[PDB]
Design a protein around this ligand. Structure first.
Ligand SMILES: CC(C)[C@H](N)c1ncnn1C
Ligand SMILES: CC(C)[C@H](N)c1ncnn1C
Ligand SMILES: CC(C)[C@H](N)c1ncnn1C
Ligand SMILES: CC(C)[C@H](N)c1ncnn1C
Ligand SMILES: CC(C)[C@H](N)c1ncnn1C
Ligand SMILES: CC(C)[C@H](N)c1ncnn1C
Ligand SMILES: [Cl-]
Ligand SMILES: [Cl-]
Ligand SMILES: [Mn+2]
Ligand SMILES: [Mn+2]
Ligand SMILES: [Mn+2]
Ligand SMILES: [Mn+2]
Ligand SMILES: [Mn+2]
Ligand SMILES: [Mn+2]
Ligand SMILES: [Mn+2]
Ligand SMILES: [Mn+2]
Ligand SMILES: [Mn+2]
Ligand SMILES: [Mn+2]
Ligand SMILES: [Mn+2]
Ligand SMILES: [Mn+2]
Lengths: 190, 190, 190, 190, 190, 190
């Protein structure tokens, strides 16, 4: 079994992650940042992980610290769950069309952090996705992928080929990471 | 079983489609537009569909009306055959090299029409592929992919990375759509 | 003697080639594509080959498949006829002026496919030469030279220095290939 | 079984290839060019081939002749091992992230040579990878992929999306070719 | 008979050339610079010369002095062997395709040194061809052709039309010079 | 025998041409324009023609009328001497290096006038070559080649690849035409 439980308590946040790589998309995410909840639920579900995330942090400041602590904890869990990485596909990639948006992610697990994020339209460096709760600043997308890659110790390449809507651009990237991971972690029959 | 029979009779054309998603590439296409017959035969065959298409239309005008009515009928059949889309991979993509040409298609079935067509060389907006019968104006390629996507209610992204020969560029795109669909419709074991 | 007979039967076409390198320009070509017949007759004749080509293919679609299958079969015949390539000039080149057009070809037989096609005016990527029969799309010129080179296993460099008329540009290139081959295949007295 | 043994003895080199497409990555390569040994070992291993390569050539001149003769022999072996290509996926592609580098390869086996190599940074046309033995001039990468494609009679498209380190750029391309081939040669269950 | 033996002993090198213009390509070259050995062997052989070159020089410094002294000695031998140049074609030219590379040389013997070298890609001014022995700096190509022309007292025009690989670009130029010389030195029957 | 005698008497000039295509370069030219005498002597001699030209014209005006009448008469003689053009090479080309200058000419005899003149440096449109007699305005070079081609009824393509000295540029073009004609008129043994 490829399960990990990570507890991460900092001055800024309190995180619990329970991750199973060999899941059916049983996913529950509650961080206090509802758009981030949606993105991590999409990630767990499209990866066919079982994933629970419970995070409380300093959202009076903004989402950044909670988002980052969550991504660090989640990456740590992914790395621990992967163990020796013996017998897995190792390489994975996925294209995700979302209406006008096309995103792609490619991964190499096998143990050296690296993240390359390209093609995200420049308006996403100062876009806010806002509802009735704590908002999500899309400039953080890159930071989430970097933190994941750095703590899981994997190579993660995330690309936006084109798109316009910041919700479509963001969600397609999270889904692309998710399906790339799904393919990479699967047993390689050879 | 994931089969559909569509009959579409308009002022301009008369179409019958019999489609099975779970096929072995048993394909017979007769539209009166032989290059289109070739492209739809390539599509059915590379998708591992069973597909029969019988169309008669107003080819004295040109192929456009028959091509469009056929693509609408075929997309309708694909949507009906997909039913609830329960348990399928949903996402699919395929690269197709054809000598100098590289084409790509990515699909998301799961229920909102969208089509993005990019990178086709500009000479394909006024190219004719002509033999001894009704010719095929390559400007129609985009129209075929749009009509398919709109009537199957799927997201279809078709890209030409590079190429020169209009037959290679056209056929690689039809084949790319076909293999992307093949992957997307397949049962997802998870 | 440097003779080869190639029969090539595909789903798309039926080809018979009889080639003698040591000929007097006794040439008969019938492919169902009369401008291609003219170009291959010019090639056989200006190479001082004896050449018969009988091809029937799917010209209801367009000339492409028949043209390509013919060029593959012809290149195969050229390679077989050349045998060990012992004692031949190996290198050949020819300039062909045709009114306003100047074309050139250079060849190296001795056994590694390579084709470089340069300087053809851009209007030839979407030009049609049309008469009362199956038309010829000049974009195919490059494809013919590539298929020949790849199946004869020779280096073929075809250049258009300048020109305007697509018939002159096309015919001068076929003639240039023909005279370059003629020189390359001839016994080298040293 | 899909095995081939090729012996190729030229004025410049002496090659023996034993190739099994249906392997477990049992790979032994010795050419006298240790970086090339590494690249061909990566290729055999990531393709899940069993592969032995023993080559001795004129490395006093430089690696080029031995590298080229090896790639020709290896491509010949791949083509022979593939036989009729009945029942295989035929199409394959793979993305390979290697730290900062992202490379891609796409293949079509089914029987016409073609190679398109794009996006390799210009500094790789005059880069040397040098250790204590015979060095490797990265300008040869393109030549290796061309020779492989031409002798296996396949379409091979190799792309560098981006990268900096010439070892990462080179190794990611060899690995991408390897995983694309792996997917293409696998039995297609349909 | 058109034979010359040149001995050239300098502070830097020791050269012996035996040249016969009316040869069969009986060629033996040993300079201590194996890529140069290969280029001069190609030159002698493609010119249908009989040629022996034995050179020892200061290769601890680099190949330059030995290469230059050899080219001077060889040019001197070519000039002496040509004698009165009575009854020869005088003018010669040759195109040499080498995979992606096309090179050309044109010569006028009849008695005034001149060398024009054009079209060599700029990367060849700082490229090294390196094996297990003394390497070859391609910037020297021009110097070799200049030294040959100046000491044989001939006009030599060497052109690279296009190419990429520095070994193909260099070898095609040496072969082009060789076949141009072959044609120029041959008896003119008129 | 391929001989012609042309007498051309106009208001401006009096011309006699005796031409033998199958000559040994027995050439005598006297037009009253000594640089033109030199160019036509070079042409006759390098073509291996036997050629006598006696022209007297209105050189008080300038050389133009005499030069043009001579070129018309000479072209007429070349056409008449060629007769049916049965059994000849038909195509000919020649490169001529002259110190810094490289010129080329290509010819097709077989019966439709055409002349393309390219690459002559712009300073040759207003250059004078002057001695102690009637001078030669190099702008006339093009006119001479046009008049020759038009009256012999041949395709003549003359190119200057590069050069500086107007005497070298002019003389290399006349010599290139001469050697191209020599090759084209020779019996083709096939
Ligand atoms: C100690 C951490 C929470 C710091 N204030 C921070 N803000 C944004 N990124 N980081 C590291
Ligand atoms: C009613 C239809 C056949 C119409 N003339 C048309 N031409 C091209 N596209 N459409 C919709
Ligand atoms: C199987 C062949 C005939 C294919 N449809 C094609 N069209 C154009 N080139 N090719 C290979
Ligand atoms: C005969 C071969 C070994 C030739 N010298 C060469 N060098 C580089 N490529 N090639 C074909
Ligand atoms: C005396 C010679 C050998 C001199 N050092 C030199 N190096 C490179 N070219 N030259 C002439
Ligand atoms: C009648 C002729 C001699 C006329 N003046 C002329 N000058 C230059 N070219 N031409 C035709
Ligand atoms: Cl891509
Ligand atoms: Cl040229
Ligand atoms: Mn941070
Ligand atoms: Mn959403
Ligand atoms: Mn329409
Ligand atoms: Mn086709
Ligand atoms: Mn084709
Ligand atoms: Mn014609
Ligand atoms: Mn090579
Ligand atoms: Mn490595
Ligand atoms: Mn020097
Ligand atoms: Mn070589
Ligand atoms: Mn005039
Ligand atoms: Mn002179």
């Amino acid at each position: 079994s490829r399960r990990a439980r990570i507890e991460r308590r900092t001055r800024e946040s309190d995180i619990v992650i329970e991750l199973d790589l060999d899941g059916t998309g049983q996913v529950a995410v509650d961080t206090g940042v509802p758009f981030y909840d949606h993105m991590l639920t999409a990630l767990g579900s499209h990866a066919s992980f079982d994933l629970t995330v419970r995070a409380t942090g300093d959202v009076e400041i903004e989402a950044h610290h909670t988002i980052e602590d969550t991504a660090i904890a989640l990456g740590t869990a992914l790395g621990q769950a992967l163990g020796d990485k013996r017998g897995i596909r190792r390489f994975g990639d996925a294209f995700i069309p979302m209406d006008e948006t096309l995103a792609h992610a490619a991964v190499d697990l096998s143990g050296r952090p690296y993240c390359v994020h390209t093609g995200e339209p420049d308006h996403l460096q100062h876009t806010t996705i806002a509802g009735s709760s704590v908002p999500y600043h899309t400039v953080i997308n890159r930071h989430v992928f970097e933190s994941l890659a750095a703590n899981a110790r994997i190579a993660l390449h995330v690309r936006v080929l084109y798109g316009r809507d910041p919700h479509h651009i963001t969600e397609a990237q999270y889904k692309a990471v998710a399906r790339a991971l799904r393919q990479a972690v699967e047993p390689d029959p050879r």
